[model samples]
Target: MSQSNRELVVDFLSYKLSQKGYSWSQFIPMAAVKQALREAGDEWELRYRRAFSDLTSQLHITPGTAYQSFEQVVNELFRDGVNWGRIVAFFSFGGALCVESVDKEMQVLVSRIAAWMATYLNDHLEPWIQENGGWDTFVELYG
Candidate 1:
């Protein structure tokens, strides 16, 4: 079955979140991620926004060194490989870095991460997703 771009993103985010121990029910109460997926103009921006909101909420306290933490997590994932889960983790961690950048007023870092995610998604994950019959199919089989 065909799916909209929005549906694909939601499914991707949902799958990623589940991998990080988030359940559908857990996100239902927060709703920001789902809403952002539905309403945000840019897919990359919304991914960052949703991930930022979620990570901040989960951590409760935003440390000054949050960007470093995000970087470390992303680095670990990179060493792990270019699998679907790692790609999702890459974006998810990038989103958290976006939040940290904003909080620190590091506009350059924000732009950098955003551009990186766009490039990575287009250059890497997008083809894999397309080859696997889109994110919906990927989610059903592996999410």
Candidate 2:
């Protein structure tokens, strides 16, 4: 069976990476990461709003925008106190690798990561969004 979206994100985040001047395995602790996100106001509802905003408003993002967006979301989700070094390294590898090769393996990895994030944001987040009323109201108060 295909891995769940949440699982994929965690998997990629936790993937054993030992290439391109890096070597590590294991992700940051979920609880610690959660704490960081809470500090940054990264509740489920807020995440939903941001993801929805990207999908709807910011179609066709440039590479720079994509990298920025990736960093923002990762920083928020992983939080600062967490093992952010690992997350940053992963993003760095991903973005850099994409530049040199758009091969089948690279495409698969990228799509899997994207699909994982999409599922988590759309499936898990949308419900919380509805419960919170709407994205705009949430943003006005929270953002």
Candidate 3:
């Protein structure tokens, strides 16, 4: 049977639940995620602007259009010839670890998710890092 949206979201979050030994709800607080996204958004805006400026052209993007662009860029830059599944796995791992909560169950979930992502990344780090030429550079270029 098909899952509900909540079930799917939870299932998606569960991807990183085991590596850190925490539950599916404890990875990060909502406030923390918002804060991180704000910071990330700022950096992303700057990078996007930089690219436009350096290339002497305006960037074509909108909330609706950016995702496809992001996927294309990830596939070309970070996937390193890997297929879409691994790319989604990489991003899903990052997103799952972004959840956080003060509730005990949520806390456990957050920890587990973060742990899982860390471990998963560790296993794939050599290829991802080599493909992107280091995490720091990748974030600067694509975040």
Candidate 4:
């Protein structure tokens, strides 16, 4: 079954949180993360998880601190010509920031990060999604 773009985004977010030792069941009780893991299967899940893990390890930062430096980190990644994995890590980090903002009731920060994520998706990922047969197809193959 194909998932909507929103679902795909949440899935990616949940995956990143899970990788960071966050309990999906604690934040999102729908078991979305588990479902995402099942849909992605073992190989893809393993690869993405490892990539996120390595990215975090190399950055030497926690999600809260990372949220503060997200823009700079993204710019550096772009300058370094990061690959798809890093791009995933980038957006996942954004998602994590959103979660933190919401949890902390930082409405202004939440809006800022949301805007950035939407713009990033439109400018970078949307064209790729369109070229690859839209979000449903992309999720079918990749998710």
Cα RMSD to the true fold for all candidates? 11.4, 15.3, 14.2, 7.2
Q: What C-alpha lDDT values do all the predictions have?
A: 0.46, 0.36, 0.37, 0.49
Each candidate's TM vs. the true structure? 0.42, 0.27, 0.33, 0.44
List the candidates ranked by lDDT, beginning with the highest: 4, 1, 3, 2
Cα-lDDT of candidate 2: 0.36
The number of the candidate with the highest lDDT is: 4
How much is 14 displaced in model 4, in angstroms? 8.9
Per-residue lDDT tens digits of candidate 4, residues 17-84?
Answer: 56655544422123453353334543444565544444334444333453435555555556755444
Better of 3 and 4 by TM-score: 4
Cα lDDT of model 2 by residue, 29-82, tens digit: 244332333323323323333333333223223332454454455435344433
What TM-score does candidate 1 get on C-alpha atoms?
0.42
Clashing pairs in 1: none
Q: Candidate 1: where are CA atoms >4 Å away?
A: 1-76, 139-143
| lDDT at residue 139 of model 4 (Cα atoms) | 41
Q: What is residue 118's positional error in candidate 3, in angstroms? A: 0.6
Q: Following a full C-alpha superposition, what root-mean-square deviation does model 1 have from the true structure?
A: 11.4
The CA lDDT at 107 in model 3 is 51
lDDT for each residue of candidate 1 in 96-133, tens digit (9 for 90 to 100): 55445555655445444544455555555566667766
Is 3 or 4 the stronger prediction by lDDT? 4
